[PDB]
Amino acid sequence: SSVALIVGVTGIVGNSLAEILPLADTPSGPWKVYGVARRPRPAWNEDNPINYIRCDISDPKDTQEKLSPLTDITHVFYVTWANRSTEVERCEANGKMLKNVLDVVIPNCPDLKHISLQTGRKHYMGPFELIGKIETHDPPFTEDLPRLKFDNFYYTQEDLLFEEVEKKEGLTWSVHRPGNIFGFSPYSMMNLVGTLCVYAAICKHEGKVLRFPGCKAAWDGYSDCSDADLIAEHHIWAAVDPYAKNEAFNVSNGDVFKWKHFWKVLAEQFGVECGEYEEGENLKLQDLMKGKEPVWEEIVRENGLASTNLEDVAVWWFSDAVLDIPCPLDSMNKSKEHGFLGFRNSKNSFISWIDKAKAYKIVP
Template sequence: MEQEVPNTNTPVALVVGVTGMVGLSLAEALKSPTALGGPWKVYGSARRPKPTWFPSSTPDITYITFDALNFDDTLKHLAPIAHEITHVFWVAIQVRENEESNVAANSTMLENVIKALKSATPSRLCHITLQTGTKHYMGPIFDPVLGTQLVHHEPPFHEDMPRLPYPNFYYALEDLLASYSPSLSYSVHRSSIIVGASSRSFYNALLTLCVYATICRYQGLPFRYPGTKYAWENFCDMSDARVLAEQQIWAAVTDRAKNQAFNCTNGDVFTWKCFWKVCCEIFDVEFVPFDENEKFDWVGMMKKKGRVWDEIVEKYGLYKTNMEEIICPEALDAVLHFSFPHVCSMNKSREFGFFGYANTLKSIGMWVGRLRDMKIIP
């Protein structure tokens, strides 16, 4: 295939993980007429074919499917465009049975993509944005062994906190990017709990709650909060996918932000009590006051609701999903049992010149509306 000669004045983005919550927001933000550094040419990649809910409003995003764990497959699909790409937005993740396996899998994926893009002669690749998260400050909380032994940093979390003495694939990916300096610059974006719209994000707290609330309404069950009193009453923060996309694009084109790590949250805090009330209004279910004496196995209950979800999908003509693949009850349950305020400092980001923000509780209705428009929930 004859290669297209790139316009050397046009930035060309490759969004790796384009069907995830932040990947979708990045694709839309990069194609916005007001995008910093634009106009951008955008490629989006994922492991699986493009879902029907992927917005038709972005027809000028070229969609590529490949397995980043397989270098030959990665090179085959990226070689024809490698000479064009100037920026990689890395929002991909694969989750394995323990953190050592997470390190191996995610490092392999990122290295395969970088090698494939740098194989071009000449290569235009100049910057990579890397999305990680607050496990940077807490350690591998989902590791079946290490997760019970962790000593985390005290919140609010800030970027100059030292690394914890545990394996962490976030650390491995940062080190991998740093090893390519100075030929490549990079920026690291540490999110909190991400809220956005997708059926293909591994940790999707909002969609998990949407499915839970929908099943409760469908079966006439109480929409009960399954966490602790501490989490119910104390502060937590979130990261709107639009704010994450905005910060990543800003860092990609701002010299000051090169080779820096930034927290990225909405800039406000909330309590799960207030969040629960918003969900009750959105899904028209009764608000049940929290009673710490009423314990119930929420994770176990949700695992038994797969057939109920199948009925709901069929009844409302939704995009076909297996409930087990779109919810993360164990991960959300861990968040709802935190015994500390899950709060990040945004001071560094503001000091460097990024002022993006979102009103967390107001944004929930918008994102639920998008999930409904995409026919992922009724």
């Protein structure tokens, strides 16, 4: 039997992995699962049968303290990261966290088979501060083109991964580069669906229009996304498929869509009048939602929602980051050619994840 450690078990993928790994039909079942995070385990994470371990993996002491007893790890799913003001900062911060974790597990887990690291499409686009400002490789992005000549903590994290896995013979790795993730996690630092749901709710409550806070390319251009269950299935796939070992793979839903169409979906789900991209207006939810914490607190009190503060449930800057540029497509051909044929209907994905938020009473 095989034992997973999910590093970031309350994140938008960590939660998906917390729910899928213990399932019976999950490959290499039955799975023992350890799940790490910092905050006290929230209610929406309890419905999974995970061994919850509070640990701040930036602290080498706490990481040695919390993870060293875990003698029986077989697979590691790194589903976390730390944000800073400069990418160079992100590099050292995210290297240290990843290194803390690996430096403990590998010498302590004689059954450790695989280490599965999640980065993202920003590997091809450059960091936030530089997105849309640098010559990238022409999309669709394929996994084994050269890295950009700009610092990127995905690269730092990768080169680190490579070294560590050599300490244990037969230890093997995989890298997964999702696009924007449609998922569920009121704690995630990048939760597009979650943030968009709060917006619509606020709009419904105020009776205003669901205006579009994005650029024409996001409205009318092709976009794609990465369903969080699929991303979880993708982690599991490389962790167990020996012909996927030691490879980076994109993971996206297998289709495209336009926000002009999904916007109507978003509106209908919350009973709001759907707005439409207006020229030269460049709305920002970061600007448009300033000071709305009393309105949220009213929406919550009224509609019976769980006690959430929008700071947690709405990451405005990230919705802006997403909608304020055009969406470069990636390719799933390497994944498919290696056997990962999983996919998701993105429109159904969107509704599915809007509805999980409703179901957990995060939004109305």
